[PDB]
């Protein structure tokens, strides 16, 4: 009479299928269970043996199975963690702290995507990757797209609920700025659409972050116009090529460029056996290369972009280009729904309100050259992002935001070098405090960082709540208290039911 036998009995006692082959446990098959656990889990840091493991994993095949799983987990007082794409930076979708026992409900079998051009919209289920959504859209039309993530393997279920920015945010805003409806499962196992859940809950799931406001089954997204021809480029500058001053110029102008123009910077050490710092300016321009060169000559001639560097292509090709696909790959590669690689990593995030001066940058370089594999990605805001209020949706990082920084340290060897890398990024984060947003020091919720504080820990939730959501946190808490009073949907940094 095991926990899983009770779980299955509760499942089948629901009037809505075999299910055995949708279960994974150490007792069934330890080898299979491990592989299912690791399958979509992206951060290898959270797959080491030291990490708490779920008693079992359940992969529902229909929406009714998701309902039954909620009902049964609640009835057996079994802690639930939801997983769609598995990209959580802190492994929150497959690793739970001090909630023994816990179960993973993995939604990777619900990947239906239905595109309807006539209404300029689409329904995408939680287990679909954004790459799959992108592919299905372009399949119907070369002049439609969607402004969500840059990474192809991001799961819908955990992506859009955090806001979902990408290379088209300066023109169309966030993925969460472009949704119409959704279907969610509440704490009582009811399926609610926007009409049933009400406007407050629908607001909450447009930036509130995953794991807090019920199980998202599907989003109804609003398609956006993209041109038949999109231009991209990647221009690389090192410190020996006036790199620091060039980056400083980028800080001053990137958020002020034409709405069609998105130029992010990818920054990492590079071999010159010494190292230098290398900045890759990667761009997507919703227009032709002729117009682009004119835009660049006026506002960023320091980059030294030439026609030779520009490549014109379809929107879907540009998506794969930015995502770092080889030119040898085809759009159908997006259908595999697999990440390009995996490693152990620790990430943090920042928002910049005033340009980091060159001396601040040089101090950053000194630290980067002290680390094995540091990497930082800077993403320009402005454009449409400045024209939306901070309280429109829970995502608060709008006007005044020059750009968002993603801090990264990665490694291949797990617990061998983990401690060193963790300490390095925390030191660097502390160094940067003087240069980034203050009161609060803003952070992106889909870049989970437990260092900011947890519900259970001694850090008050208002402190880290203010970083992710700013002035929207209090309202999120109120909604959470009303929607899930028993705190069934919860994790280390879930929106609490109350404050105090
Ligand atoms: C790995 C990775 C992440 C990226 C990348 N680039 C991004 C970008 O260009 N724009 C972005 O906006 N975000 C980017 N991120 C971060 C991702 O957005 C986040 O990592 C998302 O949370 C990923 O979602 P998903 O892939 O589904 O990860 P999961 O671990 O499955 O879930 C995350 C989080 O949400 C909860 N949750 C999952 N599924 C559901 C459902 N159906 N309903 C409610 N809540 C859900 C989980 O509990 C978990 O806490 C680029 C790369 C390479
Ligand atoms: C338990 O599950 C594991 C994992 O799928 C199974 O082991 C694999 O079996 C397949 C089929 O021959 C092989 O291709 C793999 O090489 C095996 N795994 C590895 C990597 O060794 C196994 O079949 C299952 N055992 C039972 C009892 O059915
Ligand atoms: C937007 O931010 C800029 C830069 O800080 C500021 O000057 C301006 O007042 C802000 N605009 C609005 C509408 O508040
Ligand atoms: Na706390």
Numbering used by the authors: 27 to 42, 45 to 300, 305 to 532
Text of the article:
Among them the berberine bridge enzyme (BBE)2-like proteins (pfam 08031) can be set apart due to their unusual bicovalent attachment of the FAD cofactor. Here, we show that the enzymes catalyze the oxidation of aromatic allylic alcohols, such as coumaryl, sinapyl, and coniferyl alcohol, to the corresponding aldehydes and that AtBBE-like 15 adopts the same fold as vanillyl alcohol oxidase for berberine bridge enzyme and other FAD-dependent oxidoreductases. Furthermore, mass spectrometric analysis has shown that AtBBE-like 15 is located in the cell wall and thus might participate in as yet undefined reactions relevant for the formation of the cell wall. Thus, we suggest that AtBBE-like 13 and AtBBE-like 15 participate in the adaptation of the extracellular monolignol pool prior to polymerization and are thus involved in cell wall formation required during certain growth phases and in response to stressors.
Protein crystals were obtained using sitting drop conditions yielding diffraction data to 2.1 Å. AtBBE-like 15 adopts the same fold as other BBE-like enzymes, i.e. the VAO-fold that is characterized by a FAD-binding and a substrate-binding domain (shown in green and orange, respectively). The FAD cofactor is bicovalently linked to the peptide chain via a covalent bond of His-115 to the 8α-methyl group and of Cys-179 to the C6-position of the isoalloxazine ring. In the case of AtBBE-like 15, the gatekeeper residue is a leucine (Leu-182), and thus oxygen reactivity is suppressed because the side chain blocks access to the oxygen pocket. Tyr-117 and Gln-438 are engaged in a hydrogen bond on the si-side of the isoalloxazine ring (2.6 Å). Therefore, these residues were defined as substrate coordination motif. The hydroxyl groups of Tyr-117, Tyr-479, and Tyr-193 point toward the active site with distances to the N5 locus of 4.8, 4.6, and 5.0 Å, respectively. The ϵ-amino group of Lys-436 is located 3.1 Å above the plane of the aromatic ring of Tyr-193 and engages in a cation-π interaction. This arrangement of Tyr-479, Tyr-193, and Lys-436 presumably favors deprotonation of the phenolic hydroxyl group of Tyr-193 and activates this residue as a putative active site base, and thus these residues were defined as a catalytic base motif. The docking result suggests that the orientation of the allylic alcohol toward the proposed catalytic base Tyr-193 is possible, although the aromatic ring is located in the hydrophobic pocket, and thus this orientation is consistent with the productive catalysis found for AtBBE-like 15 with this ligand.
